[PDB]
Amino acid sequence: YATVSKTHKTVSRAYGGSRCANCVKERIIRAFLIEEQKIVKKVVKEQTEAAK
């Protein structure tokens, strides 16, 4: 592999020659939702604290 040009060792996506693409779809979706649900989680317990 050292004897061979960089384009033989990647595909041009995030996580190119490392994870498998359907795998990166999953990573992205899950990241987005979980980062969203975080705002959802916070605002509930900000509400619990003031309604108690």
Partner RNA sequence: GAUGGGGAAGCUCCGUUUCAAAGGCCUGAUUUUAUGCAGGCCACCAUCGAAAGGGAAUCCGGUUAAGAUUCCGGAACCUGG
Partner RNA sequence: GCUUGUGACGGCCCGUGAAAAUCCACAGGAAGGAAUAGUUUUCAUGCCAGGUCGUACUGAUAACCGCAGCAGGUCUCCAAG
Partner RNA sequence: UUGACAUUGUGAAGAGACAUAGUUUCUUUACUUAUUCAAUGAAGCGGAGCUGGAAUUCAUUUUCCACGUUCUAGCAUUCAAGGUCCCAUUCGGGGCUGAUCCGGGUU
27 binds RNA (CB under 7 A): yes
Answer yes or no whether residue 16 interacts with RNA by CB under 7 A: yes
Near RNA by CB under 7 A: residue from 20, 21, 31, 43: 31
Residue 35 to residue 31: CA distance in whole angstroms: 6
Is residue 42 near RNA by the rule CB under 7 A? Answer: no
Cβ contact 27:19 at 8 Å: yes
> Is residue 41 at the binding interface for RNA, with CB under 7 A as the rule?
yes
- CA–CA distance from 15 to each of 1, 30, 40 (Å)? 18, 16, 29
22, 35, 48, 51: residue in contact with RNA (rule CB under 7 A): 35
